[PDB]
Amino acid sequence: ACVHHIKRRDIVLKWELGEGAFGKVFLAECHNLLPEQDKMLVAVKALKESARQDFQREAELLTMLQHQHIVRFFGVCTEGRPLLMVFEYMRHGDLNRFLRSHGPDAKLLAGGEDVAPGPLGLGQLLAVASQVAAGMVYLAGLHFVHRDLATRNCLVGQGLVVKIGDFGMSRDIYSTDYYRVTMLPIRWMPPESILYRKFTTESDVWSFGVVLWEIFTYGKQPWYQLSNTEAIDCITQGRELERPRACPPEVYAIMRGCWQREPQQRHSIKDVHARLQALAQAPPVYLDVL
């Protein structure tokens, strides 16, 4: 009723794209979806079913959260089974894979339609960071706490448009990004979330700090040199991730502003976005000097 509905005959499955424990994702054609295009490509998540409640709850939530830098959700197909969720197709996949595929080792081959060859430049990295921050501003505005913000949960589309999601499936491809106790994204979590199990807007800005670090390391795992327990010890004792090689000091300052140990002392995501956007939009003369 709140959720938009799509007729099963308007979805034509093409092939699989990914697969987790709670579902499979297919590339599909969807007819009569938008006035612009009579036919268009979409990504279809098929539920592996109790789970219908979570499914319907997720659909209601996704419909509410719709915005420029949040993953575009078109609606549901509930006529017969399996229950389908229909999303915008994002051709570059998740931001972590994208970052790794354009690292400091990348050359002409990595070049493409949307992106230059070689490592992503400072200007491109800032544009990615800015888009993610804009998504987190919107969620902060609505008083929603993500709890699992990381580059693996962001998608990258044509023209390097970047959008936040939350893929149940991330627990499968990126299993080593979680500590199993339930699965906790320890490496992305602030001391108050690890110690006291409190998750807030402020724990999300900490996590965004880590996302910024991921971006400027071309998708390396935070604390990759550490086991899960060693990482808990480090975070709880106040160790901070080192400045990435590609990160200018100005941007590392924005990361540190996210990692203030006291939640209330962390900069607001709005301030973080404001600074990163200014930098993303700054002229090459300015950016060449950082």
Ligand SMILES: Cc1ccc2nc(CSc3nnc(NC(=O)Nc4cccc(C(F)(F)F)c4)s3)cc(=O)n2c1
């Ligand atoms: C090559 C490739 C591979 C995979 C692929 N996958 C897709 C979408 S898959 C998908 N599944 N479930 C989803 N749900 C979800 O994110 N819910 C959610 C829950 C809470 C909060 C929020 C948030 F973030 F908005 F706040 C979102 S989004 C499109 C595509 O184009 N893909 C392309």
